[PDB]
Design a protein around this motif. Structure first.
Motif, mmCIF file in Angstrom:
data_model
loop_
_atom_site.group_PDB
_atom_site.id
_atom_site.type_symbol
_atom_site.label_atom_id
_atom_site.label_comp_id
_atom_site.label_asym_id
_atom_site.label_seq_id
_atom_site.Cartn_x
_atom_site.Cartn_y
_atom_site.Cartn_z
ATOM 1 N N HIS A 220 0.722 -1.301 0.000
ATOM 2 C CA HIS A 220 0.000 0.000 0.000
ATOM 3 C C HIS A 220 0.749 1.350 0.000
ATOM 4 O O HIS A 220 0.902 2.004 1.027
ATOM 5 N N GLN A 221 1.202 1.734 -1.184
ATOM 6 C CA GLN A 221 2.317 2.652 -1.385
ATOM 7 C C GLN A 221 2.310 4.152 -1.030
ATOM 8 O O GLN A 221 3.391 4.741 -1.018
ATOM 9 N N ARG A 222 1.163 4.788 -0.773
ATOM 10 C CA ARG A 222 1.172 6.240 -0.470
ATOM 11 C C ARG A 222 1.791 7.108 -1.571
ATOM 12 O O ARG A 222 2.925 7.563 -1.427
ATOM 13 N N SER A 224 2.272 9.912 -2.471
ATOM 14 C CA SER A 224 3.065 11.107 -2.162
ATOM 15 C C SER A 224 4.513 10.728 -1.852
ATOM 16 O O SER A 224 5.377 11.592 -1.680
ATOM 17 N N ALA A 225 4.760 9.428 -1.757
ATOM 18 C CA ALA A 225 6.114 8.906 -1.711
ATOM 19 C C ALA A 225 6.653 8.839 -3.124
ATOM 20 O O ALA A 225 7.840 9.070 -3.372
ATOM 21 N N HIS A 231 2.554 9.269 -9.836
ATOM 22 C CA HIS A 231 1.361 9.654 -9.093
ATOM 23 C C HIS A 231 1.264 11.174 -8.960
ATOM 24 O O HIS A 231 2.284 11.860 -8.893
ATOM 25 N N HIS A 233 0.143 13.199 -6.432
ATOM 26 C CA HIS A 233 0.639 13.775 -5.193
ATOM 27 C C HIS A 233 2.158 13.787 -5.182
ATOM 28 O O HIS A 233 2.777 14.595 -4.493
ATOM 29 N N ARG A 239 9.307 16.768 2.652
ATOM 30 C CA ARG A 239 7.907 16.451 2.862
ATOM 31 C C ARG A 239 7.013 17.620 2.479
ATOM 32 O O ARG A 239 7.295 18.772 2.815
ATOM 33 N N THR A 248 -6.356 8.238 -7.108
ATOM 34 C CA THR A 248 -4.984 8.370 -7.631
ATOM 35 C C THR A 248 -4.894 8.856 -9.085
ATOM 36 O O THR A 248 -4.010 9.638 -9.406
#
Ligand SMILES: [Mg+2]
Ligand SMILES: [Mg+2]
Ligand SMILES: [Mg+2]
Ligand SMILES: [Mg+2]
Ligand SMILES: [Mg+2]
Ligand SMILES: [Mg+2]
Ligand SMILES: [Mg+2]
Ligand SMILES: [Mg+2]
Ligand SMILES: [Mg+2]
Ligand SMILES: [Mg+2]
Ligand SMILES: [Mg+2]
Ligand SMILES: [Mg+2]
Ligand SMILES: [Mg+2]
Ligand SMILES: [Mg+2]
Ligand SMILES: [Mg+2]
Ligand SMILES: [Mg+2]
Ligand SMILES: [Mg+2]
Ligand SMILES: [Mg+2]
Ligand SMILES: [Mg+2]
Ligand SMILES: [Mg+2]
Ligand SMILES: [Mg+2]
Ligand SMILES: [Mg+2]
Ligand SMILES: [Mg+2]
Ligand SMILES: [Mg+2]
Ligand SMILES: [Mg+2]
Ligand SMILES: [Mg+2]
Ligand SMILES: [Mg+2]
Ligand SMILES: [Mg+2]
Ligand SMILES: [Mg+2]
Ligand SMILES: [Mg+2]
Ligand SMILES: [Mg+2]
Ligand SMILES: [Mg+2]
Ligand SMILES: [Mg+2]
Ligand SMILES: [Mg+2]
Ligand SMILES: [Mg+2]
Ligand SMILES: [Mg+2]
Ligand SMILES: [Mg+2]
Ligand SMILES: [Mg+2]
Ligand SMILES: [Mg+2]
Ligand SMILES: [Mg+2]
Ligand SMILES: [Mg+2]
Ligand SMILES: [Mg+2]
Ligand SMILES: [Mg+2]
Ligand SMILES: [Mg+2]
Ligand SMILES: [Mg+2]
Ligand SMILES: [Mg+2]
Ligand SMILES: [Mg+2]
Ligand SMILES: [Mg+2]
Ligand SMILES: [Mg+2]
Ligand SMILES: [Mg+2]
Ligand SMILES: [Mg+2]
Ligand SMILES: [Mg+2]
Ligand SMILES: [Mg+2]
Ligand SMILES: [Mg+2]
Ligand SMILES: [Mg+2]
Ligand SMILES: [Mg+2]
Ligand SMILES: [Mg+2]
Ligand SMILES: [Mg+2]
Ligand SMILES: [Mg+2]
Ligand SMILES: [Mg+2]
Ligand SMILES: [Mg+2]
Ligand SMILES: [Mg+2]
Ligand SMILES: [Mg+2]
Ligand SMILES: [Mg+2]
Ligand SMILES: [Mg+2]
Ligand SMILES: [Mg+2]
Ligand SMILES: [Mg+2]
Ligand SMILES: [Mg+2]
Ligand SMILES: [Mg+2]
Ligand SMILES: [Mg+2]
Ligand SMILES: [Mg+2]
Ligand SMILES: [Mg+2]
Ligand SMILES: [Mg+2]
Ligand SMILES: [Mg+2]
Ligand SMILES: [Mg+2]
Ligand SMILES: [Mg+2]
Ligand SMILES: [Mg+2]
Ligand SMILES: [Mg+2]
Ligand SMILES: [Mg+2]
Ligand SMILES: [Mg+2]
Ligand SMILES: [Mg+2]
Ligand SMILES: [Mg+2]
Ligand SMILES: [Mg+2]
Ligand SMILES: [Mg+2]
Ligand SMILES: [Mg+2]
Ligand SMILES: [Mg+2]
Ligand SMILES: [Mg+2]
Ligand SMILES: [Mg+2]
Ligand SMILES: [Mg+2]
Ligand SMILES: [Mg+2]
Ligand SMILES: [Mg+2]
Ligand SMILES: [Mg+2]
Ligand SMILES: [Mg+2]
Ligand SMILES: [Mg+2]
Ligand SMILES: [Mg+2]
Ligand SMILES: [Mg+2]
Ligand SMILES: [Mg+2]
Ligand SMILES: [Mg+2]
Ligand SMILES: [Mg+2]
Ligand SMILES: [Mg+2]
Ligand SMILES: [Mg+2]
Ligand SMILES: [Mg+2]
Ligand SMILES: [Mg+2]
Ligand SMILES: [Mg+2]
Ligand SMILES: [Mg+2]
Ligand SMILES: [Mg+2]
Ligand SMILES: [Mg+2]
Ligand SMILES: [Mg+2]
Ligand SMILES: [Mg+2]
Ligand SMILES: [Mg+2]
Lengths: 272, 46
Positions: A220-222, A224-225, A231, A233, A239, A248
RNA sequence: GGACCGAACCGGUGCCUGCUGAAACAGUCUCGGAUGAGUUGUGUUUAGGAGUGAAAAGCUAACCGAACCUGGAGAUAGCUAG
RNA sequence: GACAAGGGUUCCUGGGGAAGGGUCGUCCGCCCAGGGAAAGUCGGGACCUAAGGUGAGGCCGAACGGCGCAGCCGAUGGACAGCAGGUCAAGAUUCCUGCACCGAUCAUGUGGAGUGAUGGAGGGACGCAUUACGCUAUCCAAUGCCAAGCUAUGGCUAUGCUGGUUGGUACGCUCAAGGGCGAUCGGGUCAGAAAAUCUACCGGUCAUGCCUCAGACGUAUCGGGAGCUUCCUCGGAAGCGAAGUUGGAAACGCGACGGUGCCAAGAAAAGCUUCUAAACGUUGAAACAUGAUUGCCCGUACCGCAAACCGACACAGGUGUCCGAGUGUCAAUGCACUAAGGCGCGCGAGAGAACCCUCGUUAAGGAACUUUGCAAUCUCACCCCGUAACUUCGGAAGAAGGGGUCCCCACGCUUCGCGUGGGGCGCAGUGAAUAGGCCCAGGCGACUGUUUACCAAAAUCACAGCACUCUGCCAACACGAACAGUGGACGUAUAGGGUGUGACGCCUGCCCGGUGCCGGAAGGUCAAGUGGAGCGGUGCAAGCUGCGAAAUGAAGCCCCGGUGAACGGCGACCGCUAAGGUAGCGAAAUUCCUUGUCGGGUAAGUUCCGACCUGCACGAAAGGCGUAACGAUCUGGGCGC
RNA sequence: CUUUACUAUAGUCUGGCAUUGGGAUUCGGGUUGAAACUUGGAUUUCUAACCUGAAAAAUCACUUUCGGGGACCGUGCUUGGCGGGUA
């Protein structure tokens, strides 16, 4: 109401909680009822990922269940065992039919081994009696409800979930779903008395990472990473929170996603 | 220092195969393209 | 028991050596994991604005902010040479 | 040492010396020629199925094409009849020698009756960890047996030394752990499409009981066996053959589908056993053994952790499984030395300068070196004693710190030894080899884990936990020429998707004006389209025609309300803009001025720690502040060396 | 690569027109104070299109016997919006 927490003999295992058992009969899923070909595989289909993650996890076997239970109407059955079924999150009952055939039904809360259960319209509203809504008492709590006459039970089979029967209006009976929604179901639709078992599944503390992995993988990658390319974000210097928040592939949080449909006039109070 | 080429016959033949190139038009093209200039001896002979 | 020490194996922490190398990424010594989110064999599936990615724009056949081949194609070159 | 990949005559024999070989070469994995590879039983096919690949019909698409039930394909798995020896220069569970088994076919006798499907059922059939009992492979001991010899330099003269010390098959009332089995009558039609004498279900009736041999033993028999013998064409051929004891150890293998515990809950299908349908036979069936007959296709040499496979090389790299002995050392696949076996790595000889690599020892000193104790020491095994703050009471911890360790004798015990006492030796007794330096403070992340193949392993990413929000099931959502199909999911709000945060504990404030999002009967604007008043063209006209507005017309914005674990905002001198900082923290990974000012530590400290606060530009899920433990993380300090 | 740069666009929302039919009620009105050929709108309802599920016949196909949904949805044409998801 047991849980089994652990000592903190490891760095983990303190927070970790497992489920409770011994209500489960030791016996195997047995002969072909199961006929189990889950062949677990990630979201792939025509070769590409659709629903993200879910890439692994323990080998399972699907146990076929009888959801509609129409045909066995007017036939006695006595609960045999309660067995552990993965990919369920509910216990399932074995029993035996009077004619001698064995099947599976999900296990309502408080069903002891050896209970006499009878499917069909004339049945008493004892636990697990599989009768139509027209014959369901006002306000009584049931589960495993058919969305449409025939088919199967598409409504509230997860653990602890139930649907109380609101006063019937037309041949359509008003009911209340576990999401808190109100609906209209044909009184020709079967349902099973009571609420689902497995106590509260919800509060098992699920150990550490990898307990996740005992089940569907999902790291579950997030996004914004992720980098901007991958992606929306993504991208930043150190940060950074959002700037936008569609995800997404565009979209957003909030923003109701349901199309404007014909099922919508069988619906009562879509609001929560 | 594991290299790119790990010979495995019948993988070699599963892709790249005459049998294989016959199944699709794109390879069938390549097939008859090679029968042409380039009097070539090609595919599963090598 | 995503416990400890430590071989196999999996991995690459630090220093050095190597730099027309023994080697287009290694060697000694040192170090990490060593029943787990573990290691790996065989068969198979997914690819070029496409895939994969416990997320570096990483990997996708020794040079990937868009692979290779063939073609448009003698692209265009207010620039450099001749 | 034996295989699977892959390679392809590289194997064996006889030649050869151009080139290939890092020199040479009479030699070779090189060149020429010739030979070698043997299967009913091993592995694959004539059997089975998984993923996946197909796929008549079927469903879809500018074409080419994309789907898809049955069925088919597909071993990495299921199923399946032989072992022991011998031996070509070169093959062997293939050939031969001895003995054995399996199927198919037919004949003979028993039997003289039933046989049993493309269909039903039984079963095949499956996890992780740990573990009792019996055993074997297999290794160890000896004044056990057998064989051959000899006396070494001081001694031994065997009670020394050396080697060998059983494999198969058959039988046997012998020994034997361990291992799994209820049997039978009846009933209900609503079960398995009907059937069924089968399975399921319901009801009745009677420790032990059976079945089984892992393996041990005895007898027999076929092998093998240390060596002995003679021949020898240069070194090999043929013939002969001894005993096989007692004591000990022992598997990841066998007895098995054993026992117990655990959560993440651990293929399918044929063969196989039983049962009927249809059919044939109800005098020549099924079954049994008894000979005979028959037994196809492919692979099989050689290299195979490597000069023969992948690396452009006879390349310090990489390549999956199996076996892998002894002695010593708690144990072990560790470490040292060694067996069987294999090898000294395809240039060589001298010299003993500078420098360079990899090492050994070092006076006095002991970090003074330096960006930094980088590197390198010291430390090290097991036994005993002993051991802090802090803590989530598990930990920290192998905290630090101290002692022991060798040989002989006597004694005691659960005797691979250990304990106790006495004695001996060396500078020294895990006497050689493999085995931690430690501690006090901080910063970041809780943690194990993951990441830039080829300069970054971390404070990155993941993470359990938490929150917002979407989604009522042809779900939201994603792939897609496509009202095809599939994934989400054979899941059904204790579920699924997305987002951000990131154990745990105490917590998470103020401001919605602007942007987004949810809910918003008045009203403003608004497209095609209905409507079509009227203005014009042409014709003498019927008429044909060019534009063409009021009204009416949907979603949308404008306008109103709400919503911040929504984007955001909470000093461009206070300046007005919706408000201007609740806790907690603050010279901080944030600090400009800056080596801020005090304090601690040092002989001396731009660092580090503690304070303060004047926060250039901390602050509450881009989370705030703490936190035991963890770290090849980063920073400062001490002891030791 | 980015966005409140330009511009189109996958996608998606929405009006009109087909597929697409019937009847009650109501209002708007024409053709021969009601009758009534009716023309459409709005809500409501039915069921032959159409979607869809169970039954010995797994994707299908069927007499189907049926059960639910049903003029909606879906789909073709066109109208306007949204649209760094993409170009
Ligand atoms: Mg407890
Ligand atoms: Mg993707
Ligand atoms: Mg949870
Ligand atoms: Mg998460
Ligand atoms: Mg990044
Ligand atoms: Mg983007
Ligand atoms: Mg961003
Ligand atoms: Mg920043
Ligand atoms: Mg997406
Ligand atoms: Mg040819
Ligand atoms: Mg061929
Ligand atoms: Mg070639
Ligand atoms: Mg561990
Ligand atoms: Mg520890
Ligand atoms: Mg790596
Ligand atoms: Mg390595
Ligand atoms: Mg360590
Ligand atoms: Mg793209
Ligand atoms: Mg290459
Ligand atoms: Mg590359
Ligand atoms: Mg390029
Ligand atoms: Mg040019
Ligand atoms: Mg051109
Ligand atoms: Mg140009
Ligand atoms: Mg030009
Ligand atoms: Mg070897
Ligand atoms: Mg081969
Ligand atoms: Mg061969
Ligand atoms: Mg040779
Ligand atoms: Mg020779
Ligand atoms: Mg020569
Ligand atoms: Mg020549
Ligand atoms: Mg030479
Ligand atoms: Mg030779
Ligand atoms: Mg034979
Ligand atoms: Mg088959
Ligand atoms: Mg299949
Ligand atoms: Mg296909
Ligand atoms: Mg298929
Ligand atoms: Mg195989
Ligand atoms: Mg066999
Ligand atoms: Mg076979
Ligand atoms: Mg010989
Ligand atoms: Mg040989
Ligand atoms: Mg042999
Ligand atoms: Mg007879
Ligand atoms: Mg019979
Ligand atoms: Mg044992
Ligand atoms: Mg002796
Ligand atoms: Mg002896
Ligand atoms: Mg004997
Ligand atoms: Mg093994
Ligand atoms: Mg067991
Ligand atoms: Mg079959
Ligand atoms: Mg009959
Ligand atoms: Mg061989
Ligand atoms: Mg070489
Ligand atoms: Mg060499
Ligand atoms: Mg090599
Ligand atoms: Mg290896
Ligand atoms: Mg061993
Ligand atoms: Mg050893
Ligand atoms: Mg030993
Ligand atoms: Mg060793
Ligand atoms: Mg060798
Ligand atoms: Mg030499
Ligand atoms: Mg050195
Ligand atoms: Mg000294
Ligand atoms: Mg000192
Ligand atoms: Mg100095
Ligand atoms: Mg100094
Ligand atoms: Mg160091
Ligand atoms: Mg060391
Ligand atoms: Mg303690
Ligand atoms: Mg510490
Ligand atoms: Mg002394
Ligand atoms: Mg001493
Ligand atoms: Mg030592
Ligand atoms: Mg040493
Ligand atoms: Mg502090
Ligand atoms: Mg600091
Ligand atoms: Mg970390
Ligand atoms: Mg660790
Ligand atoms: Mg790197
Ligand atoms: Mg690195
Ligand atoms: Mg569909
Ligand atoms: Mg689906
Ligand atoms: Mg974060
Ligand atoms: Mg207000
Ligand atoms: Mg200071
Ligand atoms: Mg400064
Ligand atoms: Mg001072
Ligand atoms: Mg100092
Ligand atoms: Mg000072
Ligand atoms: Mg300094
Ligand atoms: Mg510094
Ligand atoms: Mg400070
Ligand atoms: Mg806040
Ligand atoms: Mg925030
Ligand atoms: Mg911040
Ligand atoms: Mg943080
Ligand atoms: Mg802090
Ligand atoms: Mg780590
Ligand atoms: Mg450092
Ligand atoms: Mg330090
Ligand atoms: Mg001191
Ligand atoms: Mg469009
Ligand atoms: Mg348009
Ligand atoms: Mg752009
Ligand atoms: Mg735009």
């Amino acid at each position: 109401m047991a849980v089994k927490k652990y000592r903190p003999y490891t760095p983990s295992r303190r927070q970790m909680t497992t489920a409770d058992f011994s209500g489960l009969t030791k016996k195997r899923p047995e002969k072909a009822l199961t006929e189990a070909l889950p062949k677990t595989g990630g979201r792939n289909n025509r070769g590409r990922i659709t629903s993200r993650f879910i890439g692994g996890g323990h080998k399972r076997l699907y146990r076929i269940i009888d959801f509609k239970r129409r045909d066995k109407s007017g036939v006695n059955a006595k609960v045999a065992a309660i067995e552990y079924d993965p990919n369920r999150s509910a216990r399932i009952a074995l029993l035996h039919y009077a004619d001698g055939e064995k099947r599976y039904i999900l296990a309502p809360e408080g069903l002891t081994v050896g209970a006499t259960v009878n499917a069909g319209p004339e049945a008493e509203p004892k636990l697990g009696n599989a009768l139509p809504l027209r014959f369901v008492p006002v306000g009584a709590v049931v589960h495993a409800l058919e969305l449409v006459p025939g088919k199967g039970a598409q409504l509230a089979r997860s653990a602890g979930t139930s649907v109380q029967v609101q006063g019937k209006e037309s041949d359509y009976v008003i009911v209340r779903l576990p999401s808190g929604e109100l609906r209209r179901v044909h009184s020709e639709c079967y349902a099973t008395i009571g609420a689902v078992g497995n106590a509260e599944h919800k509060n098992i503390v699920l150990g550490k990472a990898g307990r996740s992995r005992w089940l569907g993988r999902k790291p579950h990658q997030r996004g914004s990473a992720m980098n901007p390319v991958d992606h929306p974000h993504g991208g930043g210097e150190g940060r950074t929170g959002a700037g936008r928040v569609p995800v997404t592939p565009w979209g957003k949080p909030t923003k109701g996603l349901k199309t404007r449909r014909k099922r919508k006039t069988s619906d009562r109070f879509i609001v929560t | 220092m594991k290299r790119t080429y790990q010979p495995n016959n019948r993988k070699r033949a599963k892709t790249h195969g005459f049998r294989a190139r016959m199944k699709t038009k794109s390879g069938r093209n390549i097939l008859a393209r090679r029968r042409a200039k380039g009097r070539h001896q090609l595919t599963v002979s090598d």
